[PDB]
Design a protein around this motif. Sequence first.
Motif, PDB file in Angstrom:
ATOM      1  N   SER A  58       0.827  -1.201   0.000  1.00 21.08           N
ATOM      2  CA  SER A  58       0.000   0.000   0.000  1.00 21.08           C
ATOM      3  C   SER A  58       0.865   1.257   0.000  1.00 21.08           C
ATOM      4  CB  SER A  58      -0.927   0.006   1.218  1.00 21.08           C
ATOM      5  OG  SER A  58      -1.807  -1.105   1.194  1.00 21.08           O
ATOM      6  N   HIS A  59       0.374   2.306  -0.652  1.00 20.92           N
ATOM      7  CA  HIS A  59       1.101   3.567  -0.728  1.00 20.92           C
ATOM      8  C   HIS A  59       0.151   4.752  -0.578  1.00 20.92           C
ATOM      9  CE1 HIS A  59       0.225   4.792  -5.101  1.00 20.92           C
ATOM     10  NE2 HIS A  59      -0.595   3.805  -4.788  1.00 20.92           N
ATOM     11  N   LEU A  60       0.719   5.937  -0.383  1.00 19.18           N
ATOM     12  CA  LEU A  60      -0.077   7.149  -0.223  1.00 19.18           C
ATOM     13  C   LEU A  60       0.043   8.046  -1.451  1.00 19.18           C
ATOM     14  CD1 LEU A  60      -0.428   9.325   2.939  1.00 19.18           C
ATOM     15  CD2 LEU A  60      -0.117  10.349   0.679  1.00 19.18           C
ATOM     16  N   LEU A  61       1.264   8.192  -1.952  1.00 18.04           N
ATOM     17  CA  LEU A  61       1.516   9.021  -3.126  1.00 18.04           C
ATOM     18  C   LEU A  61       1.173  10.480  -2.846  1.00 18.04           C
ATOM     19  CD1 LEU A  61       0.871   8.281  -6.807  1.00 18.04           C
ATOM     20  CD2 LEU A  61      -0.137  10.342  -5.813  1.00 18.04           C
ATOM     21  N   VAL A  62       2.190  11.336  -2.863  1.00 20.18           N
ATOM     22  CA  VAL A  62       1.995  12.760  -2.614  1.00 20.18           C
ATOM     23  C   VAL A  62       1.688  13.507  -3.907  1.00 20.18           C
ATOM     24  CG1 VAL A  62       2.977  14.846  -1.606  1.00 20.18           C
ATOM     25  CG2 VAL A  62       3.639  12.600  -0.717  1.00 20.18           C
ATOM     26  N   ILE A  78      -1.483  21.995  -7.484  1.00 15.92           N
ATOM     27  CA  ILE A  78      -0.273  21.471  -6.865  1.00 15.92           C
ATOM     28  C   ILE A  78       0.960  22.238  -7.331  1.00 15.92           C
ATOM     29  CG2 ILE A  78       0.755  19.309  -6.099  1.00 15.92           C
ATOM     30  CD1 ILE A  78      -1.423  17.833  -6.882  1.00 15.92           C
ATOM     31  N   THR A  79       1.389  23.205  -6.526  1.00 17.48           N
ATOM     32  CA  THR A  79       2.556  24.013  -6.853  1.00 17.48           C
ATOM     33  C   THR A  79       3.606  23.936  -5.750  1.00 17.48           C
ATOM     34  OG1 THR A  79       2.076  26.167  -5.822  1.00 17.48           O
ATOM     35  CG2 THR A  79       0.851  25.596  -7.824  1.00 17.48           C
ATOM     36  N   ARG A  80       3.503  22.909  -4.914  1.00 16.16           N
ATOM     37  CA  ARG A  80       4.445  22.721  -3.816  1.00 16.16           C
ATOM     38  C   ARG A  80       5.712  22.023  -4.301  1.00 16.16           C
ATOM     39  NH1 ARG A  80       0.419  22.794  -0.809  1.00 16.16           N
ATOM     40  NH2 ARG A  80      -0.305  20.710  -1.440  1.00 16.16           N
ATOM     41  N   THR A  81       5.620  21.374  -5.457  1.00 15.16           N
ATOM     42  CA  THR A  81       6.758  20.666  -6.029  1.00 15.16           C
ATOM     43  C   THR A  81       7.381  19.715  -5.013  1.00 15.16           C
ATOM     44  OG1 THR A  81       8.657  22.069  -5.433  1.00 15.16           O
ATOM     45  CG2 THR A  81       7.202  22.858  -7.191  1.00 15.16           C
ATOM     46  N   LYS A  82       8.537  19.160  -5.360  1.00 12.25           N
ATOM     47  CA  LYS A  82       9.238  18.235  -4.478  1.00 12.25           C
ATOM     48  C   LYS A  82      10.251  18.973  -3.610  1.00 12.25           C
ATOM     49  CE  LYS A  82      11.355  16.635  -8.385  1.00 12.25           C
ATOM     50  NZ  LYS A  82      11.740  17.932  -9.008  1.00 12.25           N
ATOM     51  N   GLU A  83       9.937  20.218  -3.269  1.00  6.63           N
ATOM     52  CA  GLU A  83      10.821  21.030  -2.442  1.00  6.63           C
ATOM     53  C   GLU A  83      10.266  21.171  -1.027  1.00  6.63           C
ATOM     54  OE1 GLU A  83      13.762  24.293  -2.307  1.00  6.63           O
ATOM     55  OE2 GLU A  83      12.225  25.136  -3.632  1.00  6.63           O
ATOM     56  N   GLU A  84       8.971  21.453  -0.931  1.00  6.41           N
ATOM     57  CA  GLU A  84       8.318  21.616   0.363  1.00  6.41           C
ATOM     58  C   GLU A  84       7.331  20.480   0.619  1.00  6.41           C
ATOM     59  OE1 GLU A  84       9.247  24.627   2.425  1.00  6.41           O
ATOM     60  OE2 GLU A  84       7.360  25.748   2.313  1.00  6.41           O
ATOM     61  N   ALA A  85       7.564  19.343  -0.026  1.00  4.56           N
ATOM     62  CA  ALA A  85       6.698  18.183   0.132  1.00  4.56           C
ATOM     63  C   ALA A  85       7.164  17.304   1.289  1.00  4.56           C
ATOM     64  CB  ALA A  85       6.651  17.378  -1.158  1.00  4.56           C
ATOM     65  N   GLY A 128       6.044  -7.323  -8.677  1.00 10.16           N
ATOM     66  CA  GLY A 128       6.187  -5.884  -8.809  1.00 10.16           C
ATOM     67  C   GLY A 128       5.043  -5.258  -9.583  1.00 10.16           C
ATOM     68  N   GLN A 129       5.091  -5.379 -10.906  1.00  8.61           N
ATOM     69  CA  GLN A 129       4.052  -4.817 -11.761  1.00  8.61           C
ATOM     70  C   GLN A 129       4.040  -3.294 -11.675  1.00  8.61           C
ATOM     71  OE1 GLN A 129       0.043  -6.532 -13.469  1.00  8.61           O
ATOM     72  NE2 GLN A 129       0.091  -6.579 -11.224  1.00  8.61           N
ATOM     73  N   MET A 130       5.044  -2.737 -11.005  1.00 13.49           N
ATOM     74  CA  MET A 130       5.149  -1.290 -10.851  1.00 13.49           C
ATOM     75  C   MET A 130       6.607  -0.863 -10.709  1.00 13.49           C
ATOM     76  SD  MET A 130       2.145   0.031 -11.073  1.00 13.49           S
ATOM     77  CE  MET A 130       0.521  -0.704 -11.255  1.00 13.49           C
ATOM     78  N   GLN A 131       6.821   0.428 -10.478  1.00 14.70           N
ATOM     79  CA  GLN A 131       8.169   0.963 -10.325  1.00 14.70           C
ATOM     80  C   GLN A 131       9.092  -0.065  -9.679  1.00 14.70           C
ATOM     81  OE1 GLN A 131       8.588   4.053 -12.527  1.00 14.70           O
ATOM     82  NE2 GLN A 131      10.192   3.438 -11.079  1.00 14.70           N
ATOM     83  N   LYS A 132      10.064  -0.546 -10.447  1.00 15.86           N
ATOM     84  CA  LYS A 132      11.015  -1.533  -9.951  1.00 15.86           C
ATOM     85  C   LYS A 132      11.571  -1.118  -8.593  1.00 15.86           C
ATOM     86  CE  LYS A 132      12.798  -4.738 -11.276  1.00 15.86           C
ATOM     87  NZ  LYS A 132      13.027  -5.660 -10.129  1.00 15.86           N
ATOM     88  N   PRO A 133      12.039   0.136  -8.502  1.00 17.13           N
ATOM     89  CA  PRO A 133      12.603   0.682  -7.264  1.00 17.13           C
ATOM     90  C   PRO A 133      11.542   0.896  -6.189  1.00 17.13           C
ATOM     91  CG  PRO A 133      12.407   2.406  -8.913  1.00 17.13           C
ATOM     92  CD  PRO A 133      12.053   1.117  -9.600  1.00 17.13           C
ATOM     93  N   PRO A 149       9.364   8.549   3.239  1.00 17.14           N
ATOM     94  CA  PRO A 149       9.425   9.110   1.886  1.00 17.14           C
ATOM     95  C   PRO A 149      10.473   8.419   1.018  1.00 17.14           C
ATOM     96  CG  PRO A 149      10.524  10.567   3.433  1.00 17.14           C
ATOM     97  CD  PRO A 149       9.879   9.485   4.253  1.00 17.14           C
ATOM     98  N   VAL A 150      10.035   7.886  -0.118  1.00 15.42           N
ATOM     99  CA  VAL A 150      10.935   7.200  -1.037  1.00 15.42           C
ATOM    100  C   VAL A 150      11.165   8.024  -2.299  1.00 15.42           C
ATOM    101  CG1 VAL A 150      11.322   5.129  -2.413  1.00 15.42           C
ATOM    102  CG2 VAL A 150      10.167   4.957  -0.198  1.00 15.42           C
ATOM    103  N   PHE A 151      12.432   8.243  -2.632  1.00 16.09           N
ATOM    104  CA  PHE A 151      12.789   9.017  -3.816  1.00 16.09           C
ATOM    105  C   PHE A 151      12.764   8.141  -5.066  1.00 16.09           C
ATOM    106  CE2 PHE A 151      13.669  12.958  -1.893  1.00 16.09           C
ATOM    107  CZ  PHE A 151      14.300  12.734  -0.686  1.00 16.09           C
ATOM    108  N   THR A 152      11.607   8.083  -5.718  1.00 16.07           N
ATOM    109  CA  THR A 152      11.450   7.282  -6.925  1.00 16.07           C
ATOM    110  C   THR A 152      10.119   7.571  -7.608  1.00 16.07           C
ATOM    111  OG1 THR A 152      11.652   5.030  -7.832  1.00 16.07           O
ATOM    112  CG2 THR A 152      10.312   5.310  -5.842  1.00 16.07           C
ATOM    113  N   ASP A 153       9.843   6.849  -8.688  1.00 15.77           N
ATOM    114  CA  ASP A 153       8.601   7.028  -9.432  1.00 15.77           C
ATOM    115  C   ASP A 153       8.503   8.444  -9.992  1.00 15.77           C
ATOM    116  OD1 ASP A 153       5.362   7.947  -8.750  1.00 15.77           O
ATOM    117  OD2 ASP A 153       5.764   6.367 -10.223  1.00 15.77           O
ATOM    118  N   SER A 154       7.843   9.324  -9.246  1.00 18.42           N
ATOM    119  CA  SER A 154       7.673  10.709  -9.670  1.00 18.42           C
ATOM    120  C   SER A 154       7.533  11.634  -8.464  1.00 18.42           C
ATOM    121  CB  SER A 154       6.444  10.841 -10.572  1.00 18.42           C
ATOM    122  OG  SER A 154       6.726  10.387 -11.886  1.00 18.42           O
ATOM    123  N   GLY A 155       8.537  11.615  -7.593  1.00 13.48           N
ATOM    124  CA  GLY A 155       8.508  12.455  -6.409  1.00 13.48           C
ATOM    125  C   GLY A 155       8.658  11.658  -5.129  1.00 13.48           C
ATOM    126  N   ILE A 156       8.011  12.121  -4.066  1.00 14.16           N
ATOM    127  CA  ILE A 156       8.077  11.444  -2.777  1.00 14.16           C
ATOM    128  C   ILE A 156       6.826  10.606  -2.531  1.00 14.16           C
ATOM    129  CG2 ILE A 156       9.366  13.428  -1.928  1.00 14.16           C
ATOM    130  CD1 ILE A 156       7.026  14.235  -0.277  1.00 14.16           C
TER     131      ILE A 156
END
Length: 163
Positions: A58-62, A78-85, A128-133, A149-156
Amino acid sequence: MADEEKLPPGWEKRMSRSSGRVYYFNHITNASQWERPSGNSSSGGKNGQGEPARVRCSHLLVKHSQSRRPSSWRQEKITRTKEEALELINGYIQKIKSGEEDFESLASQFSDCSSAKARGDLGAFSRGQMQKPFEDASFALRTGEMSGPVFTDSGIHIILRTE
């Protein structure tokens, strides 16, 4: 795994907006395939551990303004980007770690968007069936050991081993 972004310039992995199919489709011949060009490969998997067949993940995805076409549901902005997330999930752990709000309720109250339909979740993560990492997350901890928080896919993002 030799079928996503580690292939030669020509076929490239693609999807078919209509069903659960998958193919690369040639750019020169314009011919469709069944995924995996096999133009230079064959094997290269396995690891060297318990080797878990499958474990509900299970995941949350920001999600931020870095992905492709930002769109949530309870806030089309969504203008918070991966800086203030790193100031939302970090504190969110204290909410789930206490079990006061629980991940169940907190799932159907935010989650992310698409995964926020089936009670904030997806299903069983097999092969897997999803982002290898990413998939390696539910297979790199114990039943319940939710990772931050995991650094992969498309952000945190976050992945917990929900058996």
